[PDB]
């Protein structure tokens, strides 16, 4: 089941039950992934999309037909794609949780801060919906962290994992290359059994990600 806007530039595809992936096109037409979680208690989200124009339009998308309110929304990194739309959280009494140092990268690149309270293992629970939130290190970016779904086995790498066709790393201008791979071993020794990962950009996929990664990285 995939849900789509007017314009094509937003979607939301289901993984299951309450889990959803939403996905939306910048211009420079890139795509970049998150997730969106329906619980007992509104609607949580993993990372946010690329503008404060898309992020408002994915909300009130997700909000309109699930009938609920974004409750929660978990900024992996401080780059535009997830915390693009920080703004549009704050106003709209949406917490944007973030590790410190995702906080204040944050507001070094010129975004609105978000509330830096995730340590280097969180646990969160909305609803019936237990989310984890853990920072491998340096990576991608030097904050970067990845989401786990214990109840489905769904890790969200965020772009610390590339897609199966991605042969590019992306940019690695705020990237930490050679930690990356020690970062996505920790990922590998902490989760032992993934079903589903969830690339920042592309296709769902598998551990075979992580893999594909690892072997760009060499
Ligand atoms: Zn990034
Ligand atoms: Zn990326």
Request: charged share 25%; net charge neutral; aromatic share 6%.
């Amino acid at each position: 089941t995939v849900i789509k806007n007017e314009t094509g530039t937003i979607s939301i595809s289901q993984l299951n039950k309450n889990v959803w992936v939403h996905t939306e096109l910048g211009s420079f037409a890139v795509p970049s992934n998150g997730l969106v979680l329906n619980t007992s208690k509104g609607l949580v989200l993993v990372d946010s999309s690329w503008d404060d124009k898309l992020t408002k339009e994915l909300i009130e998308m997700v909000e309109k037909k699930f009938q609920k309110r974004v409750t929660d929304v978990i900024i992996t990194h401080a780059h535009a794609d997830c915390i693009g739309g920080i703004k549009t959280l704050k106003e709209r009494g949406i917490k944007a949780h973030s590790t410190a140092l995702t906080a204040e990268l944050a507001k070094k690149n010129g975004y609105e801060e978000p509330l830096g309270d995730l340590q280097t293992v969180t646990n969160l629970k909305f609803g019936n919906m237990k989310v984890e939130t853990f920072y491998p290190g340096k990576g991608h970016t030097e904050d970067n962290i990845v989401v786990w779904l214990p109840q489905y086995n769904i890790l969200v790498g965020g772009c610390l994992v590339k897609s199966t066709s991605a042969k590019d790393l992306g940019n690695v201008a705020d990237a930490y290359v050679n930690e990356w791979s020690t970062s996505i071993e920790n990922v590998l020794k902490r989760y032992r059994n993934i079903n589903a990962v969830v690339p920042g950009h592309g296709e769902v996929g598998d551990k075979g990600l992580l893999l594909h990664t690892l072997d760009l990285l060499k």
